[PDB]
Structure formats: C-alpha cells, structure tokens
Amino acid sequence: IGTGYDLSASTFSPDGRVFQVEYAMKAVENSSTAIGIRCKDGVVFGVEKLVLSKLYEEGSNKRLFNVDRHVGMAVAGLLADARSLADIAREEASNFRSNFGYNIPLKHLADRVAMYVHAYTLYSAVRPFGCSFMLGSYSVNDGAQLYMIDPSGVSYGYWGCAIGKARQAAKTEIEKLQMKEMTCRDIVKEVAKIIYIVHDEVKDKAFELELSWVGELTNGRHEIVPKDIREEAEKYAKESLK
C-alpha cells in the first residue's frame, strides 16, 4: 500500500514508482470519458458531459476547448485542473507565436506541455496535474496528429484514444472501427455512437454529448460541431443505438 512513501511526489517506492502519479491515474480513471478520432483531413473530439443537475445551463463546464486557432483541447479529470492546464498551454502557444512567428506544431506543443506538466510531477511543494488532456490539430503542410498526455507526463501519439471510466471499454469498441480512411463526415457518426454506447444509463445517467473538430472542413480551424451537423449526429446515434 506504500504508506510512508506516497505523502509526496519526490519519494520513490521500494518497487521504484511514484505513487502520486499513480493516484492521479486513478483519479483520471474515476473521471468522465472523452474520445477523439483523427480523420483523413482533420481531427474530431467528443465529450461525454454529465448534467449533475438540470439547474446547470447547457454548455456549462465546456470541456472541448481550443488552445490555438488550429489546436483543440479535450481533457478528462478535474475541471479546475483542466482550466489551469489549458491556460498554461494557451500561454505557451502565445509565447511560441510571439517568439517564432508561426503556428505551433501539435507535436512540439505536446512536448512543451508535457515538460511543464512533468515540472509539476517531480516537485514536493506542488502536485502533478491530475488530469488527462487531448491535443488535436490539422496543418495543410504537416498533416493531422493526435496526442494523449496524462498526469504521468507521457505524451504518446494515439490515432484515436479515450480516457475515463471506460478506457478499456472504449478501446474494445474503437478497435472494431476502421479509422485511417474516412473523413470527419463519416467519423462523427462513429464517435457519436461510441460515446452513446460507452455511457452507463442505469448508473451515472443524465449525460449530454458535445463535439468539436479541427480540419479543412472549417479551414484548419477548431470549432464545436455546427448545430445542424450536431443534431444530425444525434439522429444517427438514436437510429444506430436503436
């Protein structure tokens, strides 16, 4: 159980593991589920948002942010953590633009944000950012990339990944989908049905689906799904979820 070793993030285990980042893993797996898929000419994002109370307005706690004009922001974990990480990432992108004069590559932004989130992982006076976030972009001269960065600090490249209480579940049902060929039009449908099947209705009901994407379909610009395409995706979901 590691008692006496997991009171700080600068203390290793007898097996050689920092238990703070593992507890952050646990917190992320105890959070909401978000999927993303990169299409042929862009990337799309999907958030399963639980309406804890109908008193909450729609669009509250918006979770699919956009770090840059061409870079989105999907994230699972703590909303305060999500906003702080988004803010530091936005400042990083703005500094990159101010110093280097062009758009930040997704891989380079992921590397910088992973270094920064690591800088909060290994200190003792601070705590690792217990939230896992997504990076997505589309550049006409670079391509499309997707990255998942967890509080552990590892920024690996995933074609399309999920984070939350249905990590393995979403892996099982996103593996059956063929991915690399179709574009956002034929990928939003799959994302919608995947999100609507991973959610549990008997327990943790009352969820809504919000979506966002980046790509040439909006001129390499990240934005939420248009209301018409949004209701069309919901209609395909209700038809396909039967």
């Binding site: 290793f12 590397d111 552990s152 600090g153 590892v154 690996y156 490249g157 995933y158 892996k171």
Partner: protein
C-alpha cells in the same frame, strides 16, 4: 537500521543513500530494455518496443532520440523523465555550442548532465530524474564513444552497456561476447546487439518491434536506422 529511505538528502547508517537506489529500481519500472554496442568505428543502439494496441502512432513512440546533429541518445525508465532529460541534454548541448563554438564531446555531455543529476540528488528540492541514459557519438583522435548516465549522476564510458528489466543478464551476455576479442564490425556490432536482445528476451522478435540508431566515422550524423535497413540487418541476421 531502516527508516532512512524517505528523503533524498538523508544519509542512512553505514552511509547508504536509499532513495537513490529506489530511483535506480525505478529505472527498471518502464518494463523495457536497451543495449548499446560499439565497434572500431561504429556504435549501435537498439531498444525494445511494446505496443498495447494498434491504436497508437508508432512514429512518435520512438525510445531513441538525437541530442545534436552528430550526437544520438537512447534511454529508458519513466518516459516523462526520459523526455525531460533529453530536453535538458539538448539545452545543455546547445548552450555548450553557443559558449564554446564547437560540438559537445560525448564524454563532456555525459559529465555535465551527470553533474546536473548530482546536484539534483544533493539537494532535497528535486526528484532525481529516475531515467538512465546512453549517449553515443564520434570524436576525433579518440573514435566512437558510448557513455551511460544514471539518476545518481554516475557516468562512465562503455565498450558495451545495457539497461532495463534485463540489465544483469544483458551485461553478462555482453561480457561473454567481448571476452572473445573480435573486431566487431558495424554489421557485426548490430547483430551482436540484436542477438543479445533476442536471447535475453527469448522472443526472436519480428523486425517491427525494435528501433535502432547508429553513428559511424563515415556517417557522423546520428542515423536512425529506418525500417528498410533494420529489416535488412536483422533478417540477414536471421539467415546468417
């Protein structure tokens, strides 16, 4: 006896720094392994690749990197510590090039980054970056060098080195090969590395599960051995 294994800055009885050994054990926690072999004018680095699913982008999960245009790097352990340490190494190499006007020798790069890790393990403000490093390169009047760095800041040159879960058996196999006193040509060095990995793992891996980097005197650039050439090398090893 015990109870002194809580702070990096606390000396236990018998003067034993527990937490540093805890970090060394954390090196293994990555679950991977890596080996480096050096020839007369070549130095081959090979590392294992484990993919939980096809869902990941294999082009970004490389475990070996390039510090400067002629200095390559491989490492293992926690991947976040790995990328932070390669960022610091690149920063230090660029600073050295800026200040002194010529490329960083492998030995000096290892020395400086090991000094950084020592300062990390000397003061209690830092978790000592629990990832081990292996650096390769070519230097004039000395030839190829292979150097290893560890979180404790202990650095040393190696004719052949290893890391990961299978450290001790890989080192024993390396000793068994080097005691025969053979020249280790470039293809021979690469094949010794592949055979070491395959036997210590007992897997006889498919060529898609290994990343290889090599630096030679005729190719001072750190060349990441592409899929075509690694296929050639290791399927030739298969038939050879």
């Amino acid at each position: 006896s015990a109870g002194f294994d809580r702070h990096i800055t606390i000396f236990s009885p018998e003067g034993r720094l527990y937490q540093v050994e805890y970090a060394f054990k954390a090196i293994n926690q990555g679950g991977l392994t890596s080996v480096a072999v050096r020839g007369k004018d070549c130095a081959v680095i090979v590392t294992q690749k484990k993919v939980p699913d096809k869902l990941l982008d294999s082009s970004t999960v490389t475990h070996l990197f390039k510090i400067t245009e002629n200095i390559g790097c491989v490492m293992t352990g926690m991947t976040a510590d790995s990328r932070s340490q390669v960022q610091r190494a690149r920063y230090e190499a660029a600073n050295w090039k800026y200040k002194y006007g010529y490329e960083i020798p492998v030995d000096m790069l290892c020395k400086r980054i090991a000094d950084i890790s020592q300062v990390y393990t000397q003061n209690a403000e830092m978790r000592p970056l629990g990832c081990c490093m292996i650096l390769i390169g070519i230097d004039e009047e000395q030839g190829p060098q292979v150097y290893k760095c560890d979180p404790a800041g202990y650095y040393c040159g190696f004719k052949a080195t290893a890391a990961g879960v299978k450290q001790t058996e890989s080192t024993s196999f390396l000793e068994k090969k080097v005691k025969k006193k053979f020249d280790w040509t470039f293809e021979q060095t690469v094949e010794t590395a592949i055979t070491c990995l395959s036997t210590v793992l007992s897997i006889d891996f498919k060529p898609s599960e290994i990343e290889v980097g090599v630096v030679t005197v005729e190719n001072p650039k750190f060349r990441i051995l592409t899929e075509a050439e690694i296929d050639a090398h290791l399927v030739a090893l298969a038939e050879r």
